Amino acid sequence: TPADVLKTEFELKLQSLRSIKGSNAPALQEWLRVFVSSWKTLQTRLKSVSIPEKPTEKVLQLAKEKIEKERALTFKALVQVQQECLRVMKQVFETPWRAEELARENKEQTAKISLLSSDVEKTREHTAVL
Amino acid sequence: AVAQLLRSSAE
Amino acid sequence: MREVISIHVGQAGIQIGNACWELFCLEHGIQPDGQMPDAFNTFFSETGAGKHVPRCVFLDLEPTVVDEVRTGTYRHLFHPEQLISGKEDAANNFARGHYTIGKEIVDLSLDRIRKLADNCTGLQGFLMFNAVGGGTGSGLGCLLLERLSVDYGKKSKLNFCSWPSPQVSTAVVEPYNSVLSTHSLLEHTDVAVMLDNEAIYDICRRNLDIERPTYTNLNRLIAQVISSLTASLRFDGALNVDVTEFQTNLVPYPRIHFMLSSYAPIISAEKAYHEQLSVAEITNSAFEPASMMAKCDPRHGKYMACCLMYRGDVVPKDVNAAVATIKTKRTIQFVDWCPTGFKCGINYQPPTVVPGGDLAKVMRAVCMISNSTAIAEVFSRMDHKFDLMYAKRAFVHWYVGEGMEEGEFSEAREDLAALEKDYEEVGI
Amino acid sequence: MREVISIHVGQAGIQIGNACWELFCLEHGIQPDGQMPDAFNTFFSETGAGKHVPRCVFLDLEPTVVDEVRTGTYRHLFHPEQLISGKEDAANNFARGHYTIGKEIVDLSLDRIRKLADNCTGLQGFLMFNAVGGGTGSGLGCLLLERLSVDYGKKSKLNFCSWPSPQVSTAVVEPYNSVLSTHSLLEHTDVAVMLDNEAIYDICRRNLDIERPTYTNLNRLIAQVISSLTASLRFDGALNVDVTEFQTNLVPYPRIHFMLSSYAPIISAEKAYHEQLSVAEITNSAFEPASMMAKCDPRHGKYMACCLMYRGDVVPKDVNAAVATIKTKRTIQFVDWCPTGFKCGINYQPPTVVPGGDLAKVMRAVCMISNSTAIAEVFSRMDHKFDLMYAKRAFVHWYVGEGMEEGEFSEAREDLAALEKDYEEVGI
Amino acid sequence: MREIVHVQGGQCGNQIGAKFWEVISDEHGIDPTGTYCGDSDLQLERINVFYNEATGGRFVPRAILMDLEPGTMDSVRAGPFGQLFRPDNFVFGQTGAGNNWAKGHYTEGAELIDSVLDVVRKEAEGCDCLQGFQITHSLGGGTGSGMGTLLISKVREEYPDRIMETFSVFPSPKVSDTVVEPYNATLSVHQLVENADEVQVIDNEALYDICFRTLKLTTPTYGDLNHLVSAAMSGVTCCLRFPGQLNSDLRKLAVNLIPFPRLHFFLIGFAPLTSRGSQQYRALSVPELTQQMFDAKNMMCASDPRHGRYLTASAMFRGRMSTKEVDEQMLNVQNKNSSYFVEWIPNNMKSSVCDIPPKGLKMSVTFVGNSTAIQEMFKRVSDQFTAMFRRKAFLHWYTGEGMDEMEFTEAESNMNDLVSEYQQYQ
Amino acid sequence: MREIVHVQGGQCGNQIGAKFWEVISDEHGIDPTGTYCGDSDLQLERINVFYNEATGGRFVPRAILMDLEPGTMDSVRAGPFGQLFRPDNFVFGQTGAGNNWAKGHYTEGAELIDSVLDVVRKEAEGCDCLQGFQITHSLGGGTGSGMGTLLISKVREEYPDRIMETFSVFPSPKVSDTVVEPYNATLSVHQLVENADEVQVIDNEALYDICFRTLKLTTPTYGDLNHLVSAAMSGVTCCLRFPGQLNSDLRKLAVNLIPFPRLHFFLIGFAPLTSRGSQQYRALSVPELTQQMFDAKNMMCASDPRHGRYLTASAMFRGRMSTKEVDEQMLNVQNKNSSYFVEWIPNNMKSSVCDIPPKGLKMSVTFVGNSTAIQEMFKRVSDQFTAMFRRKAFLHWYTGEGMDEMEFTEAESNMNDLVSEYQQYQ
Ligand SMILES: Nc1nc2c(ncn2[C@@H]2O[C@H](COP(=O)(O)OP(=O)(O)OP(=O)(O)O)[C@@H](O)[C@H]2O)c(=O)[nH]1
Ligand SMILES: Nc1nc2c(ncn2[C@@H]2O[C@H](COP(=O)(O)OP(=O)(O)OP(=O)(O)O)[C@@H](O)[C@H]2O)c(=O)[nH]1
Ligand SMILES: Nc1nc2c(ncn2[C@@H]2O[C@H](COP(=O)(O)OP(=O)(O)O)[C@@H](O)[C@H]2O)c(=O)[nH]1
Ligand SMILES: Nc1nc2c(ncn2[C@@H]2O[C@H](COP(=O)(O)OP(=O)(O)O)[C@@H](O)[C@H]2O)c(=O)[nH]1
Ligand SMILES: [Mg+2]
Ligand SMILES: [Mg+2]
């Protein structure tokens, strides 16, 4: 088994991440099977071989059609695993990134409450003067 | 019109 | 004294009910006129000289399909004001069907709902049909959801939503309509059945061998699913199933209430010439992963609950034996906290065939109701296509400039992520 | 109770399996459409009121032979998805019949095989019929039987291969397409019966004296053999024998599993009525080399086991009289390590010979299935022609173009070479 | 019911529009005298979408025939089906716009816009609740482009939440009648992008190419050129007249195509187009219909759509056809030339099935899509404008009639801003 | 089902292919007005391989008719069964190649190649699955040897997994029409041996030679001369259309007559061949059909197999006829012609039997074969270059369209190399 030992240590990172309640994360078991699926469509490439024969243009075009099938397949196998690192690491970083922009609503709410309570003070002062 | 006969063709 | 109330919102729901109440009329012996020449009481009322009228409403915002039914052959079956007709089509817009074109006919709709639901006590629940990919289905039908949630608190509601396709389009705005409507059906519906067009497409391509069917060929198969769902409510049987049995005995959690339907056998007259439809092989085809009504593979899912209604000359021995051999089938995994995961109900009336269709006169049928984590990833692909065409602010001006605020998208993403929390912590 | 499932892969498989089913339909009395105007259980189901359907599959990627049984005379004996067709031929190519064009149709076959297997328990074995020199019969015969040993591993399997000959093959890539699949039909299969085209040609030349019967009458003779093999399961007999007794009794070793077929008395309609076809002379004509069905001369070989399946009005006492005189004569020879080497199985039912076929009335008939070391000479010239072809890289470009790398010729070369060296260490 | 309103502008829009009412009268079976023939149910149900009852059983079109010169209104009423329109619906000019946008928009169409806005409003408040205005007008000519854009400016101010479909025919690169082509063209472009819910373009040079190589006509008269455009005219709005398995609106097309309000320029195509000797031998099947519709030789605009990307495309299907081959073959044209469709919007196609086949065709299709292959056409009007503006040519006829050169300078500024955000997404 | 695309090039290609749709139409009972008569199941069951439903009930052949002169197009339409064809598949050429390869391929060949691809692609993709190509052209004229072979090279890139079957007629040694024959011959050969999967040679003087003393025809016209090679073309494709006991395909012939991909040149022949005054006077027996096959007096090539060795060869039988005699007679030809067959293949004879004969005869048989007897035709054009290319003659016409003598040396060299493995396997 060339890379079959890489699954088992991966969900051990999951169970530690679940027990850490501070860094709450959404469902990323889609994350497991795609880091599987991208890696399985990278292991066979030091075994994928083609052999030609006495060269006619029929042979060369179809036999090389295998090699742009899998040089394109390295391009697919890189691109879903990169975009899903882009979007789920986004949506787990978005909970602490939400925390800074709701540090501003704490400032806004305290400013409005303190200024309105000050407005209660000036209305109490002005009515007694009249 | 010839476009009428061609677009609406039955026989 | 005993009834259920159906809603059909959107052009999808109206055509679904066009074959649904065609099948119910011929199975009860009554004619499209309205009268036959007590077991029919849960769908049809009684009025004077043997007449029966449906307990149905047809809601639309465009006047095309509703007027066409009024001018169809079922003129005198439906009550003429149970078909509530709008003028402006909602036009694939969640904001239009909610905040601009919704309130002028949803008050008139609930005026009809109250009048027919207050007819008889012992009301069971609402069986509503919509498309969340459209405008009037996803906009007006969602508007029904919160107002039924505030005047009928304890009445059950069972969604039957045609969830949009994972592979084809027939619109380009179904990412916006569908996941905005799943916000306000988590907290409003109770058992939410997932249908898909291309699941129905595939099963009629091989199990019926229909090469090129239309939408009216789909609506008969949905009609047979609804009929086998409420068959134990209508006719006598050994193990009758109430609608309140589905909610209590299937969903384990209030938030986990999504669904994966299936039906078997859907057989043709030519193909039944060479096949005996024994109880063993019709439930193996019912648990067959390709023959599901939503296009999700349960092999990379995990079941938690199953409800089977057998409809016909079924014998209880190969009921328990065939669910035993599908329990020992290692390909069908079950969750570790539900050691028994089957609920078997038995009806005595065999399914009736609609003439001129492709289904054949069968002696028995299976209706498959499954709860599994396969529904977690039918929302994961639609979340996947959501962020791809939302990152550069596409189609926004038809929603924020129409009458709702920007930011309904952001927390529709948040409660869909919160949806997937519950659908993944339950599978461990 | 007991059933047997037959596979029919390739052009030889479809036609041989064709004649197998008109013989069976006349034997059990079912007329073609499926009606009879419980001994037929092992080859037919019960699809309702008097309906019976055969238990087989018909696989060929050439649609030219499958549409012609679809639209021929037996359009409705068979199930509609029991007749499976591809789109294009494999065209004498093991490489793409196993890798590229055969892959999309194997799963479309095994979902009907699994359907036939879940009908009733007690499934006795897996007969199959293929051409070893045909691209579909070899590629799809191998690819089906690879994962069939994965899934249904313990169940026994029978083989009937139209093996080539030193003079007649109707092909030029025959050495390639034949022993490339012997790498699989040693490691996977259980009991394999070798057939030959001109062995059936000359058995009609010098016994029937018909100069022009075509391929359809060869299929009649093979149908005679298959029926006479399985009819001890089909009917009752004085000494019964079934498939799993064949599986145990004949083969001594797991790698010496290649039989040798014969039938007696294969006799014309004007010859048989004019003579006693008696037990003594029929057995004496069964072993003599002109009745053989592989064109292998057993003078330089020894019989391993010999199983004779009589039928008709054979009293079971002169079976032993006819065997005592055939063992004691020096023309046939056994290997020294089998003192006893025989089994006889009696069946009461005489043949119901197809009217208009070339066979005549036999009150008694034996089908001969014998292991021998005479499988050495049928394969040794096959290895010489493979060496004469592969030595200058002939025809390799048609194989490596689809995904079968060079080297699977060579690893099949010493698998075949391990086969012949297996033979002489057994004999000596 | 939902009612849609037609407005004819220019001599192009008067003749094209008058033949639009030929094919709607053909679908609905209306005689030239105004009566109805055929006696079919759903052919006459939603007739109100284009026609109004005249308490005599005749159906008057809700159209506004309108021009600066009475030469073309006389030709419409003299021709076939000319005794059908309302005489009040003809708004007459007398001087005639001399291919000048300035007098069309400011000084001569200004005393005619008040007369015609009263007529447009007259057919507006007389019903329950309208849908919008779809118009047909010219760009190269003065009486179409100069004064038609005034009417779009006026009706947006009074009815703001409605739909402005514009079937706008554009000047041709190769064949050049009306020597001041880009002046009347560009002066209505920036005054329509801020003014129209959707614009969809027609080109006479591409209409010539279709009728040559796919129709096989040796002598194409202007009536023939006005017919295959009129097939697409009837197609886009046919779903509001006949029922179907998947109905749609022009509200539906507008919301389900454009991603941003600054781009609403569609391409128009129609299929099947089959020659006189070819109607017998070509199988009208949906896979044959759908690649003809996705072909540059079928394109009514001479912008080569394979030189750019398709952003969002919507296609009806009109007839009794199965819905497998409705939807899965636009999946197939999404897949096979995936490089010809944009990436950041998944599943870029839309469908809507009408149940009634058109007259003589068992099934038909119209392509309506905001393909971003429009840059090369906005440049081919740009670079002839800038070539004739740096020499200050022919500007005394424009600056002398009530407008300044700053109106020109903001015209290339909206031109460049419009095409810069087109080239952004390609 | 399987689809065969049947493309023409050059005047000789158009006349031969037009006779192909004579011999196929009457084997399928097809009236020239398109309707079918003949009430037999076996004709209509496999008909999509060569025809197409036209939603008229009538069948159009899937044939692309391509040439550079409209005169031979006029001869096709005016003759019998010429209305069955598809005129958008008629790709007209106007200027005409004057037997010049360079202007038929490079300069003027590049213009109509885009239109003929659009024709050949839109029934190839329109079918559910394709089997192979079937081309008829000539090496003599520059219109077919120039633009037809360009069509060989350009369908090559986008259809890689489909077989490539090519019927080509070759020059003459003794009588020489179109005197630039040797240049136009090998200028198609140097690409045909790597772009075409199987090449089948026809020769007009061998075909005359068959018409003389095995058909007893004193006055041989071009009509029946093309008809003999037309029935040979019907045979190699018939077993797809018709059932049999031992089935076969076009690609079935390819995968096993080609031990090495450079040698794929096959010798065509058709039996039985007898005079009108002996057709129902002679015993049609199975042994004497193969006597007519395996000789130099029926084969349709300018070759003597007596100077060569049949490396691999194949036979295809038609009609109700038993089959073990086929195997023993085709052993019996191998063991008496033992010095005429190679040794490094066992049992070199393919056998195929289909159960339906053509009309007129109760049984027929078609012979193909990869022999080394192609070699003497290739060195008899090679030594024509030894005499003519040495003189630098008739090359200013070629170099006027962008030709290089380095392309000519490649043309001579790879055909010289092609001879070298022909002699290597003898
Ligand atoms: N199963 C089924 N699906 C349908 C039917 N009608 C429409 N749909 C699907 O519903 C999806 C969108 O909803 P629609 O019904 O088309 O539109 P709508 O719900 O009426 O909303 P509007 O477009 O505003 O009128 C489409 O993608 C269709 O595939 C139907 O009759 N049966
Ligand atoms: N005895 C007998 N042999 C047959 C029959 N049909 C085919 N064969 C054998 O099959 C061999 C050729 O292979 P086929 O069976 O025709 O081909 P296939 O199995 O369909 O696979 P392909 O070669 O790809 O077409 C011949 O040499 C025959 O020996 C038959 O009807 N009877
Ligand atoms: N399709 C079409 N094009 C027209 C018609 N009349 C004029 N044109 C084109 O429009 C251009 C002139 O536009 P014109 O009618 O003078 O503009 P106007 O000022 O609005 O009348 C010419 O290049 C013509 O090719 C017509 O009836 N149909
Ligand atoms: N058998 C046969 N040969 C032909 C026919 N027409 C032309 N040829 C041969 O083709 C050669 C002429 O080349 P061709 O391709 O027809 O010229 P082009 O098509 O006009 O450029 C001559 O040597 C003719 O012998 C025909 O109808 N039958
Ligand atoms: Mg085959
Ligand atoms: Mg709608």
What is the identity of the amino acid at E154? K
Selecting from E227, E359, E361 the residue whose C-beta is nearest the C-beta of B3 gives E227
Catalytic option among C88, C198, C245, C402: C245
**Sequence-ordered strand ranges (E) for E276-360:** 313-319, 349-354
Nearest to E13 by CA among E166, E208, E174: E166
CA atoms within 13 A of residue A104's CA, in its CB half-sphere: 4
A47 touches chain D (CB under 8 A): no
DSSP assigned state of E247: -
Q: How far apart, in whole angstroms, are the C-alpha atoms of residue F265 and residue A67?
A: 30
Q: How far apart, in whole angstroms, are the C-alpha atoms of residue C423 and residue E217?
A: 64
Catalytic option among D3, D27, D68, D245: D245
Tell me chain C's radius of gyration from C-alpha atoms: 21
Q: How far apart, in whole angstroms, are the C-alpha atoms of residue D388 and residue D385?
A: 5
Q: How far apart, in whole angstroms, are the C-alpha atoms of residue E4 and residue E48?
A: 9
Supply the residue whose CA is at minimum distance from atom 17 of ligand 3. Answer: E141
In sequence order, what DSSP letters do the residues of D293-352 get, joined into one string?
SS---GGGS-EEEEEEE--BS--TTHHHHHHHHHHSSTTS-B-TT-S--EEEEB-SPPP-
Residue D245 falls in the annotated catalytic set: yes
Contacts F328 to D, Cβ<8 Å: 168
Q: Name residues whose C-beta falls within 8 Å of residue D333's C-beta, 6 or more positions apart in sequence.
A: D302, D303
Q: Are strands E4-9 and E59-61 parallel, antiparallel or unpaired?
A: unpaired
Beta carbons of F54 and F88 less than 8 angstroms apart: no
Closest CA–CA distance from residue C203 to any residue of chain D (Å): 14
DSSP assigned state of D35: B
Residue in the block written with tokens 């636009």: E330
How far, in Å, from the CA of D59 to the mean position of ligand 5? 10
Q: How far apart, in whole angstroms, are the C-alpha atoms of residue E204 and residue C226?
A: 55
Beta carbons of E19 and E230 less than 8 angstroms apart: yes
Q: How far is CA C188 from CA C32, E172, E175, in A?
A: 34, 57, 63
| Residue C219 assigned to a binding site | yes
In sequence order, what DSSP letters do the residues of E371-407 get, joined into one string?
-S--HHHHHHHHHHHHHHHTTTTT-HHHHTSS--THH
Which residue numbers come right before each break in chain D (C to N over 2.5 Å)?
37
Nearest to E66 by CA among E113, E126, E19, E131: E113
Dihedral (Cα; F258, F259, F260, F261), 10-degree rounding: 20
Q: What are phi and psi of D369, to 5 degrees?
A: -130, 110
Contacts A54 to F, Cβ<8 Å: 260-262
Q: Which of C197, C219, C220, C224 to mutate to test the pocket of ligand 1 (most atoms within 8 A of CB)?
A: C197
Per-chain residues with Cβ under 5 A from ion ligand 6:
C 11, 62, 89
| Residue E127 assigned to a binding site | no
CB pairs under 8 A between A and D: 15
Beta carbons of D159 and D223 less than 8 angstroms apart: no
Q: What are phi and psi of C297, to 5 degrees?
A: -75, 120
Q: How far apart, in whole angstroms, are the C-alpha atoms of residue F388 and residue F254?
A: 35
In sequence order, what DSSP letters do the residues of F22-81 get, joined into one string?
HHTTTTTTB-TTS-B-S--HHHHHT-TTTEEE-SSS-EEE-EEEE-S-HHHHHHHHHSTT
Q: How far apart, in whole angstroms, are the C-alpha atoms of residue F14 and residue F36?
A: 24
**Terminal CA-CA length for chain F:** 40
For residue C245, what is the enclosing H or E element? helix C243-250
Nearest to C351 by CA among C364, C338, C342, C370: C364
For residue C281, what is the enclosing H or E element? helix C279-284
Helix (H, G, I), strand (E, B) or coil at C124: strand
Q: How far apart, in whole angstroms, are the C-alpha atoms of residue C152 and residue E269?
A: 51
| Residue C136 assigned to a binding site | yes
What is the number of the ligand 3 atom nearest to the C-alpha of E229? 1
Helix (H, G, I), strand (E, B) or coil at E293: helix
Q: How far apart, in whole angstroms, are the C-alpha atoms of residue F254 and residue A120?
A: 98
Helix (H, G, I), strand (E, B) or coil at E169: strand
DSSP assigned state of C35: B
Q: How far apart, in whole angstroms, are the C-alpha atoms of residue E73 and residue E92?
A: 8
CB pairs under 8 A between C and E: 115
Dihedral (Cα; E248, E252, E258, E261), 10-degree rounding: 150
Q: How far apart, in whole angstroms, are the C-alpha atoms of residue E341 and residue F67?
A: 36
Q: Are strands F163-170 and E163-170 parallel, antiparallel or unpaired?
A: unpaired
Residue in the block written with tokens 């409660």: C415
Beta carbons of F289 and F271 less than 8 angstroms apart: yes
Task: Using alpha carbons only, give the angle D325, D326, D332 rounded to the nearest 5 degrees.
Answer: 145
Nearest to D210 by CA among D354, D356, D27: D356
Dihedral (Cα; F147, F153, F158, F159), 10-degree rounding: 100
Q: How far is CA F206 from CA D138, E45, F301, in A?
A: 41, 74, 5
Beta carbons of C123 and C117 less than 8 angstroms apart: yes
- State which approach was used to obtain the coordinates: cryo-EM
Q: Name residues whose C-beta falls within 8 Å of residue A127's C-beta, 6 or more positions apart in sequence.
A: none
Nearest to E216 by CA among E166, E277, E156, E153: E277
How many CB atoms are located within 10 Å of the residue E378 CB?
A: 18
Axis-axis angle for helices F142-154, F181-195 (nearest 10): 10
Partners of residue D404 on adjacent β-strands = none
What is the number of the ligand 2 atom nearest to the C-alpha of D177? 23
Partners of residue D350 on adjacent β-strands = none
Q: How far apart, in whole angstroms, are the C-alpha atoms of residue D202 and residue D209?
A: 9
Ligand nearest to the backbone CA of F184: 4
**Rounded to a whole number, what is the largest CA-CA distance in chain E?**
63
Helix (H, G, I), strand (E, B) or coil at E62: coil
How many CB atoms are located within 10 Å of the residue D338 CB?
A: 14
The tokens of A93 are what? 């970083």
| Residue F424 assigned to a binding site | no
**D397–A59 C-beta distance less than 8 A:** yes
Q: Are strands F310-318 and F364-371 parallel, antiparallel or unpaired?
A: antiparallel
How far, in Å, from the CA of F365 to the mean position of ligand 4? 27
How far, in Å, from the CA of D376 to the mean position of ligand 5? 28
Nearest to D174 by CA among D184, D163, D185: D163
Helix boundaries (H) for F238-309? 238-241, 250-257, 286-293
The tokens of F52 are what? 């197409």
The angstrom resolution of this structure is 3.5
Beta carbons of A101 and A69 less than 8 angstroms apart: no
Q: Which of F66, F73, F138, F226 to mutate to test the pocket of ligand 4 (most atoms within 8 A of CB)?
A: F138
Question: CA D112 from chain center: how many Å?
Answer: 22
**Rounded to a whole number, what is the largest CA-CA distance in chain C?**
63
Beta carbons of D307 and D243 less than 8 angstroms apart: no
Question: With the C-alpha atoms ordered D289, D295, D300, D304, is the resulting torsion angle positive or negative?
Answer: negative
Nearest to C229 by CA among C160, C166, C165, C133: C160
How far, in Å, from the CA of C11 to the mean position of ligand 1? 6
**F53–E281 C-beta distance less than 8 A:** no
Question: With the C-alpha atoms ordered A52, A57, A63, A68, is the resulting torsion angle positive or negative?
Answer: positive
What is the identity of the amino acid at D136? T
Nearest to D266 by CA among D368, D349, D159, D347: D368
Q: How far apart, in whole angstroms, are the C-alpha atoms of residue B8 and residue F223?
A: 41
Helix (H, G, I), strand (E, B) or coil at E411: helix
| Residue F226 assigned to a binding site | yes
Nearest to E108 by CA among E72, E143, E149: E143
Q: Name residues whose C-beta falls within 8 Å of residue E87's C-beta, 6 or more positions apart in sequence.
A: none
Contacts 24+ apart (CB under 8 A), D24-29: D24/D54, D24/D227, D25/D77, D26/D352, D26/D354, D27/D227, D27/D231, D27/D234, D27/D352, D28/D52
Q: How far apart, in whole angstroms, are the C-alpha atoms of residue C190 and residue C328?
A: 31
The tokens of E275 are what? 């020659």
Residue in the block written with tokens 């022919």: E394
The tokens of D218 are what? 């060869």
Q: How far apart, in whole angstroms, are the C-alpha atoms of residue D66 and residue D85?
A: 6
Partners of residue E361 on adjacent β-strands = none
Beta carbons of E361 and E60 less than 8 angstroms apart: no
Nearest to D218 by CA among D353, D357, D351: D357
Supply the residue whose CA is at minimum distance from atom 26 of ligand 2. Answer: D170
Q: How far apart, in whole angstroms, are the C-alpha atoms of residue D24 and residue D43?
A: 8
Beta carbons of D109 and D84 less than 8 angstroms apart: yes
Helix (H, G, I), strand (E, B) or coil at E267: strand
Beta carbons of C366 and C292 less than 8 angstroms apart: no
The tokens of E306 are what? 């394979």
Q: What share of chain D is helix, strand, coil (3-state, %, to 5)?
A: 40, 15, 45
The tokens of F196 are what? 């075409």
Q: How far apart, in whole angstroms, are the C-alpha atoms of residue C341 and residue C323?
A: 10
Burial (0-12, 13-18, 19+ Cβ within 10 Å), A108: exposed
In sequence order, what DSSP letters do the residues of D273-304 get, joined into one string?
GGS---HHHHHHHHHSGGGBSS---GGGS-EE
Residue in the block written with tokens 């009921």: C319
Interface of D with C in 42-71 (CB under 8 A): 45-48, 51, 53
Q: How far apart, in whole angstroms, are the C-alpha atoms of residue C89 and residue E67?
A: 34
Q: How far apart, in whole angstroms, are the C-alpha atoms of residue D313 and residue A62?
A: 64
Q: What are phi and psi of C307, to 5 degrees?
A: -130, 125
Tell me chain D's radius of gyration from C-alpha atoms: 21
Q: How far apart, in whole angstroms, are the C-alpha atoms of residue D283 and residue E103?
A: 116
Nearest to F92 by CA among F14, F18, F20, F155: F14
Q: How far apart, in whole angstroms, are the C-alpha atoms of residue D342 and residue D323?
A: 9
Q: How far apart, in whole angstroms, are the C-alpha atoms of residue D69 and residue D63?
A: 10
Ligand nearest to the backbone CA of F69: 4
Helix (H, G, I), strand (E, B) or coil at F134: strand
E361 touches chain B (CB under 8 A): yes
Residue in the block written with tokens 């036009």: C91
Helix (H, G, I), strand (E, B) or coil at E310: strand
The tokens of E114 are what? 């008040």
